[PDB]
Amino acid sequence: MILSGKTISEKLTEKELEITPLTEEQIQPASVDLRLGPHFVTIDDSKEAVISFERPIRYREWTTSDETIVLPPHTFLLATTMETVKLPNHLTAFVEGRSSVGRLGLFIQNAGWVDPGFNGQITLELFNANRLPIELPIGRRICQLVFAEVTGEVAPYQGKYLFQKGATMSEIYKDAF
Amino acid sequence: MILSGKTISEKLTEKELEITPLTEEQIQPASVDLRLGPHFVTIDDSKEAVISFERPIRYREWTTSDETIVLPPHTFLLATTMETVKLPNHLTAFVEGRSSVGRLGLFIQNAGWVDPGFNGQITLELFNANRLPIELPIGRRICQLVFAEVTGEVAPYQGKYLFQKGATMSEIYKDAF
Amino acid sequence: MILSGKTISEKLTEKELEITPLTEEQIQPASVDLRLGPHFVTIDDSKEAVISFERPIRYREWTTSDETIVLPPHTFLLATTMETVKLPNHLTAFVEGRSSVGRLGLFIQNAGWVDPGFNGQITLELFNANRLPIELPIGRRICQLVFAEVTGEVAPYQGKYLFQKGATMSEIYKDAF
Ligand SMILES: Cc1cn([C@H]2C[C@H](O)[C@@H](COP(=O)(O)OP(=O)(O)OP(=O)(O)O)O2)c(=O)[nH]c1=O
Ligand SMILES: Cc1cn([C@H]2C[C@H](O)[C@@H](COP(=O)(O)OP(=O)(O)OP(=O)(O)O)O2)c(=O)[nH]c1=O
Ligand SMILES: Cc1cn([C@H]2C[C@H](O)[C@@H](COP(=O)(O)OP(=O)(O)OP(=O)(O)O)O2)c(=O)[nH]c1=O
Ligand SMILES: [Mg+2]
Ligand SMILES: [Mg+2]
Ligand SMILES: [Mg+2]
Numbered sequence: 084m085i086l087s088g089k090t091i092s093e094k095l096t097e098k099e100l101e102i103t104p105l106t107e108e109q110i111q112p113a114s115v116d117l118r119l120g121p122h123f124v125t126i127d128d129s130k131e132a133v134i135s136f137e138r139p140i141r142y143r144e145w146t147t148s149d150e151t152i153v154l155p156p157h158t159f160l161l162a163t164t165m166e167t168v169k170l171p172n173h174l175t176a177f178v179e180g181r182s183s184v185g186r187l188g189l190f191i192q193n194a195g196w197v198d199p200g201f202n203g204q205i206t207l208e209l210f211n212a213n214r215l216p217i218e219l220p221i222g223r224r225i226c227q228l229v230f231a232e233v234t235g236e237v238a239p240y241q242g243k244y245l246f247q248k249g250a251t252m253s254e255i256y257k258d259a260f
Numbered sequence: 261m262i263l264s265g266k267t268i269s270e271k272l273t274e275k276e277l278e279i280t281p282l283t284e285e286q287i288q289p290a291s292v293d294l295r296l297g298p299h300f301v302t303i304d305d306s307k308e309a310v311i312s313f314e315r316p317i318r319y320r321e322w323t324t325s326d327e328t329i330v331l332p333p334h335t336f337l338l339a340t341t342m343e344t345v346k347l348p349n350h351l352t353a354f355v356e357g358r359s360s361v362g363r364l365g366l367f368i369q370n371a372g373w374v375d376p377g378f379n380g381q382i383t384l385e386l387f388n389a390n391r392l393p394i395e396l397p398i399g400r401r402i403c404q405l406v407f408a409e410v411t412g413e414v415a416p417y418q419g420k421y422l423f424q425k426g427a428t429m430s431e432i433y434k435d436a437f
Numbered sequence: 438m439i440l441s442g443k444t445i446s447e448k449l450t451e452k453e454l455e456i457t458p459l460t461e462e463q464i465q466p467a468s469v470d471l472r473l474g475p476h477f478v479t480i481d482d483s484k485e486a487v488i489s490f491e492r493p494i495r496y497r498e499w500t501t502s503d504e505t506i507v508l509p510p511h512t513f514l515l516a517t518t519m520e521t522v523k524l525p526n527h528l529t530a531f532v533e534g535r536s537s538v539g540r541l542g543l544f545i546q547n548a549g550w551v552d553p554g555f556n557g558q559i560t561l562e563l564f565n566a567n568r569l570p571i572e573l574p575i576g577r578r579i580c581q582l583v584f585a586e587v588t589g590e591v592a593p594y595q596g597k598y599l600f601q602k603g604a605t606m607s608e609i610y611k612d613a614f
Contacts, residue, residue, distance in 0.1 A: 084261065084438070085352050085373070090412030108437065112375040112417050113352050113410050126542065126567060133507075134541050134571040153310075157334065157511065159542045159566040175439050175467050175583070179372040182421065185385045186430035187311050188303075188336045190369045192544045192566070195533040196583045198466040199441070208539045210566050212336040212369065212387050213303060217311040224435065229352070229373045231261065232411075233467050234438035234586075235447075240466050244536065255537035258578065260462055261438065262529055262550070267589035285614060289552040289594050290529050290587050330487075334511065356549040359598065362562045363607035364488050365480070365513040367546050389513045389546070389564050390480060394488040401612065406529075406550045409588075 086174075086230040088112050100230075101169035109224065116181065116224040117164040117205065122146045124161040124250040136255045144250065151218045154189070154211040161250040164205040165222065172199045172237040176228040178207075184225060188213035191226050200239025203247035263351075263407040265289050271351075277407075278346035286401065293358065293401040294341040294382065299323045301338040301427040313432045321427065328395045331366070331388040338427040341382040342399065349376045349414040353405040355384075361402060365390035368403050377416025380424035440528075440584040442466050454584075455523035463578065470535065470578040471518040471559065476500045478515040478604040490609045498604065505572045508543070508565040515604040518559040519576065526553045526591040530582040532561075538579060542567035545580050554593025557601035 086094070088110045094100040102115065109116040126134065127141040134140055154160055170176060175198070180191035193208035207226060211217050219225075243254040263271070265287045271277040279292065286293040303311065304318035311317055331337055347353060352375070357368030370385035384403060388394050396402075420431040440448070442464045448454040456469065463470040480488065481495040488494055508514050524530060529552065534545030547562035561580060565571050573579075597608040 084409045084411035087376070087410050087412035087414045089415065093412075106437065112349075112377060112414055114373065114375070126569070128568055131569060134543075134567060134569050136538075136541070136572070136574050136577060140541065157566075161540060177373065181432075182370065182372070182383070183430045183432035183435075184313075185370045185372075186338060186383060186428070187313070187317070187432065188385070188387075190385075190387070193536065193539050194371060194548060195536070195539075196439070196468065196531065198468070200466060206536070206540065208542075208544075210544075213311060214305065214335075215303065215308060215311050218313065220313050223313060224437075231408075231585075232438045233441050235441035235444035237441040238443060238466055242465075251540075253537045253540035255535075255541065258537075260460065260578075261585040262587050264553075264587050264589035264591045266592060270589075283614060289554060289592055291550065291552070354550065358609075359547060359549065359560070360607045360609035360612075361490075362547050362549075363515060363560065363605075364490070364494070364609065365562075367562075367564075371548060389511075390488060391482065391512075392480070392485060392488050395490065397490050400490060 084232055085113050091115055091230055099171055102166050105166060114227040114229045116227045117166045118222050119219060119225040120163040120165045121221050122163050122249040124252055138256050142252050151220045153216050153218055154209060155216045156211055156214050158211050160209045162207040162209050163250045167204050169202045170197060170199055172239050173233045174230055175199050175233055176230050178205055178226055178228055180226050181224060189217055198240035199233050199237050202245060206251045261408045262290050268292055268407055276348055277351060279343050291404040291406045293404045294343045295399050296396060296402040297340040297342045298398050299340050299426040301429055315433050319429050328397050330393050330395055331386060332393045333388055333391045335388050337386045339384040339386050340427045344381050346379045347374060347376055349416050350410050351407055352376050352410050353407050355382055355403055355405055357403050358401060366394055375417035376410050376414050379422060383428045438586060439467050445469055445584055453525055454528060456520050459520060468581040468583045470581045471520045472576050473573060473579040474517040474519045475575050476517050476603040478606055492610050496606050505574045507570050507572055508563060509570045510565055510568045512565050514563045516561040516563050517604045521558050523556045524551060524553055526593050527587050528584055529553050529587055530584045532559055532580055532582055534580050535578060543571055552594035553587050553591050556599060560605045
């Protein structure tokens with residue numbers, strides 16, 4: 084079943100689930116809002132002519148001290164949540180944008196289910212689908228997690244992104260198969 | 261998790277859930293198709309240079325009497341469902357495009373879970389990802405809802421978009437934090 | 438509930454669910470990775486001026502023998518999984534991109550729930566959101582399925598895309614009502 088916000092609170096309190104740092108008002112009817120962090124990554128368009136899955140891609144990364152960041156029209160940017168999340172083996176969580184955000188043409192393209200056992204901040208794929216730039220304010224609620232129960236024995240997440248911090252560039256080129 | 265189409269039909273007939281107006285053939289194996297309404301909103305590019313999360317953004321809104329609307333290439337547009345949806349406290353619903361629509365490069369970017377207790381029409385985020393314009397026919401099935409049960413005590417949706425009608429502009433600037 | 442990877446394995450071995458061809462390492466904590474096939478479809482820009490929901494749209498389709506394909510910047514392309522999937526009536530599956538892929542600006546826009554009873558390859562909606570072209574390697578893991586149980590009686594999928602093979606163009610023009 085999808086977990087109610089209240090159930091999410093209970094599980095946090097009992098440490099079945101960790102989401103930190105967190106304010107109680109981030110808890111929603113059946114989701115929890117997460118916030119935009121100060122750290123960003125973009126593909127280095129001056130150095131790379133083509134994007135590849137078979138080798139590392141050069142990129143620029145930075146932490147801003149400003150209150151906002153600008154995302155220009157039709158531009159893609161990697162960001163991160165302030166929150167570090169730790170899921171036990173029997174939960175998964177669907178990351179999605181907040182409706183208020185998507186309605187301004189900011190698409191959280193990374194929308195998907197977090198592997199049970201995942202431990203880290205959440206890397207976000209931001210796309211400005213408008214013809215105008217968007218000013219993103221750091222620390223504002225940008226996306227949310229919807230939790231669901233997993234049935235059966237679980238082999239927990241042991242992949243590339245365990246313990247990730249910051250907007251974390253793809254490591255697709257490490258695929259063993 | 262997920263309610264079968266038949267279960268959705270039952271819950272509708274017993275008024276546990278409301279979706280209206282509705283034809284029986286909108287009911288699918290484990291989803292229900294919703295239709296594109298005549299009402300649209302776009303950002304007022306003659307008055308705004310930059311999109312902000314901290315104040316209202318001016319916009320143009322209109323209802324068309326034409327059978328179709330044209331969405332030009334690489335353009336983003338807010339739309340709405342014809343259907344008004346009312347969810348009880350123990351159900352949530354995932355909005356997503358229909359595969360037939362996404363395959364023509366029309367992306368329903370607003371894909372996500374509706375808060376338990378939500379009551380209103382659904383605002384859609386349309387993006388034409390082609391280099392050609394798309395003719396969207398009004399009243400055609402454009403997206404669908406996938407229903408899931410919620411476990412635990414629920415504080416129902418009391419947010420910005422309760423009772424929304426029409427394509428409804430973002431009210432992100434009303435965030436308390 | 439969402440099925441664990443182990444549960445997915447069991448159901449495969451007992452033929453409750455079919456996904457073929459498949460390597461055991463495609464199985465993940467609570468999902469299964471699928472691979473990019475060699476077959477592609479693009480809208481025929483030399484023959485169509487406008488995209489329509491009301492008639493067939495001309496397109497070019499091809500199978501590549503090359504190891505990679507190039508998707509130019511801000512371009513949308515239809516692709517397919519290598520895997521054929523057959524779902525019984527009591528399961529549904531959420532298709533989504535792999536985080537490693539989305540982080541390079543390749544969006545799997547078709548993200549959504551597969552109808553119970555669906556039988557076919559999965560057609561993917563690829564969008565390159567970067568300013569650089571992307572080289573997609575054929576046969577690499579590109580997306581994944583997250584399985585969920587369906588509660589209640591099910592009328593199985595009897596729609597347009599039963600038995601689909603290859604990147605399969607939209608048949609939206611076949612809608613009744
Ligand atoms: C959905 C999502 C996942 N993730 C994290 C949580 C997941 O457990 C983790 C892996 O997602 P996957 O989709 O499994 O990514 P992957 O297959 O490319 O990585 P691996 O080969 O290691 O499996 O990525 C984000 O950082 N942001 C997101 O938006
Ligand atoms: C989500 C997804 C579905 N599909 C397939 C599996 C689904 O059972 C099938 C239908 O999804 P739908 O979203 O129902 O598409 P539709 O309503 O446009 O088509 P129909 O009228 O036939 O119902 O499409 C893909 O090929 N790729 C995908 O990414
Ligand atoms: C997913 C979705 C939700 N909605 C509506 C129904 C949801 O219950 C409602 C809220 O979505 P949320 O993501 O909670 O919106 P928000 O957090 O930006 O707004 P609030 O601060 O009020 O929570 O928006 C749409 O109009 N279209 C959609 O595609
Ligand atoms: Mg909200
Ligand atoms: Mg359908
Ligand atoms: Mg993975």
